[PDB]
Amino acid sequence: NIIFVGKKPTMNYVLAVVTQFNNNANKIIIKARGKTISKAVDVAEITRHKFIPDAKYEEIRLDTETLQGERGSSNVSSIEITLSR
Amino acid sequence: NIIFVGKKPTMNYVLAVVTQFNNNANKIIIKARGKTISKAVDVAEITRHKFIPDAKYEEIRLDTETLQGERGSSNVSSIEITLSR
Incomplete structure (x- = not known):
């Protein structure tokens, strides 16, 4: 029920979302x-x-996720978007 | 009270936000x-x-906005983050 948005064209992910609503999931999470x-x-x-x-937007969460590092290396921002209805 | 995040380095925008909080702002909007x-x-x-x-995250708003593009009108995603104490 979770859609990890990566490098594919945007409409793939839009399709994944629509598909899942039409198999009556009530909530979808985009990450x-x-x-x-x-x-x-x-x-x-x-x-x-x-x-x-x-x-509709049920909720939007913003976080930071930790990455394996060399000194100076970065961590990364993340979003989780919940849709319903 | 409104910071438009554009082309400058990230830390410039952090600085504008932290300054405003140091000068005792209650609500800061990042767009x-x-x-x-x-x-x-x-x-x-x-x-x-x-x-x-x-x-704290008071409110997170996702929208679509329009701009003059290269070839007529154009639609882009926009975000509005409200930070508070």
């Missing part, structure tokens, strides 16, 4: 890290504009 | 659109983890 946080927002916005006109 | 939605999340996560450890 992304780093640069692709932009794309996760796109996925959710396209979905509710063109394809599930009644989708 | 970004497109690719730099990633950078906005960065600004707020770093601020929270490293400078204002009691800064």
Whole structure:
């Protein structure tokens, strides 16, 4: 029930979301890290504009996730977007 | 009270946020659109983890906005993060 948004074209992820709503999941979670946080927002916005006109934001969580490191190495921002209805 | 996260380095925006909190602001809004939605999340996560450890997510709003593109109108994702104490 979780869609990890990665490197595929955006519409793949929009499709994954729609597919799962039409097998009556009530909640969908979209999750992304780093640069692709932009794309996760796109996925959710396209979905509710063109394809599930009644989708609403249940909640949005922002976090940081820790990465294996060399000194100076970075961690990474993450988003989790919950949709329903 | 409104910081538009654009092309400058992340730490510049962190600085503008932390300054405003040091001058006793209650609510800070960070806005970004497109690719730099990633950078906005960065600004707020770093601020929270490293400078204002009691800064809270009051509200997170995802939207779509339009801009003059290369070829007529264009739609981009936008984010509005409200941090508070």
